[PDB]
Amino acid sequence: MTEIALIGNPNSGKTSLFNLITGHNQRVGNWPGVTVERKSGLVKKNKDLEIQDLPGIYSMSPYSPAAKVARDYLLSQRADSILNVVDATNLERNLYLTTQLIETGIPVTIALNMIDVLDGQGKKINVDKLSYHLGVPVVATSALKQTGVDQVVKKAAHTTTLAFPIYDDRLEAAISQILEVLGNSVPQRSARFYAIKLFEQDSLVEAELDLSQFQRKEIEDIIRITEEIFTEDAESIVINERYAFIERVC
Ligand SMILES: Nc1nc2c(ncn2[C@@H]2O[C@H](COP(=O)(O)OP(=O)(O)O)[C@@H](O)[C@H]2O)c(=O)[nH]1
Ligand code: ALF
Numbered sequence: 001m002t003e004i005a006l007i008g009n010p011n012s013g014k015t016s017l018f019n020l021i022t023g024h025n026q027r028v029g030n031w032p033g034v035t036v037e038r039k040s041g042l043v044k045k046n047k048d049l050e051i052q053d054l055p056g057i058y059s060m061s062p063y064s065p066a067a068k069v070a071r072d073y074l075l076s077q078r079a080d081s082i083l084n085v086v087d088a089t090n091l092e093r094n095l096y097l098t099t100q101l102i103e104t105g106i107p108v109t110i111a112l113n114m115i116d117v118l119d120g121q122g123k124k125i126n127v128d129k130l131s132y133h134l135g136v137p138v139v140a141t142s143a144l145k146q147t148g149v150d151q152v153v154k155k156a157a158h159t160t161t162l163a164f165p166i167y168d169d170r171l172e173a174a175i176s177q178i179l180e181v182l183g184n185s186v187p188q189r190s191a192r193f194y195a196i197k198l199f200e201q202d203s204l205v206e207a208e209l210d211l212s213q214f215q216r217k218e219i220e221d222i223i224r225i226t227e228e229i230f231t232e233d234a235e236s237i238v239i240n241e242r243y244a245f246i247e248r249v250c
């Protein structure tokens with residue numbers, strides 16, 4: 001069955017969207033941290049789509065066990081579509097997570113939620129330009145006004161029937177080298193995600209993959225060589241490339 005996962009920052013409106021899509025009445029609150037575990041439901045208008053409400057998350061290197069629930073569901077390879085719920089009033093901050101979601105290889109559809117909040121403040125956001133620069137479908141949504149909901153579910157449903165944010169080519173060289181070291185050690189769909197996290201020296205991914213000493217020695221050498229090329233630490237190279245990619249689109 002087609003699985004759509006609701007991924008987004010805390011308090012961005014994920015459960016609000018879930019309740020409209022499923023007809024459920026899961027807990028919704030005007031403060032972050034209401035949802036703490038996964039909740040499933042059928043799309044009321046297409047009973048062939050199953051959608052998953054998940055706790056808020058800021059980064060695929062999560063800062064909390066609740067957020068790690070959302071990361072673990074994505075990396076369990078059970079989701080066919082990521083419905084990325086983006087707080088339209090906090091575009092830049094939300095898009096940092098969005099870049100990592102795209103790298104997972106699971107097709108991403110953006111629900112630009114709380115668009116009524118932006119409307120009241122007289123602010124505009126060209127969805128077509130944002131979609132063009134991110135490489136994913138984008139739909140302005142409002143769970144309060146109940147606008148755009150059915151539309152974003154259809155496009156998420158159809159991404160399941162991929163262009164990654166391409167960073168500095170010096171970093172892309174290292175990513176390709178780490179990919180060839182990984183081989184089939186990771187699911188092919190999410191190979192780029194694991195390669196980047198390994199470059200970031202992410203502790204979660206390192207503990208999860210359990211690579212051989214032969215693999216780890218080369219990855220370390222790739223990181224060190226690339227760090228010398230950038231004259232910057234590995235973790236900061238990726239963070240700077242994510243934000244630099246965002247500013248070109250925002
Ligand atoms: N104005 C406006 N408020 C919203 C929208 N979506 C959600 N909210 C409000 O934001 C708060 C948090 O929503 P919630 O569903 O709990 O977000 P979640 O934490 O990601 O699940 C609730 O008080 C909602 O009423 C929207 O599109 N527009
Ligand atoms: F902050 Al929440 F579900 F309560 F993402």
Ligand SMILES: [Cl-]
Nearest residue numbers: 058059062063
């Ligand atoms: Cl987080």
Ligand SMILES: [K+]
Nearest residue numbers: 011029031034
């Ligand atoms: K909330």
Ligand SMILES: [Mg+2]
Nearest residue numbers: 014015034035
């Ligand atoms: Mg919630």
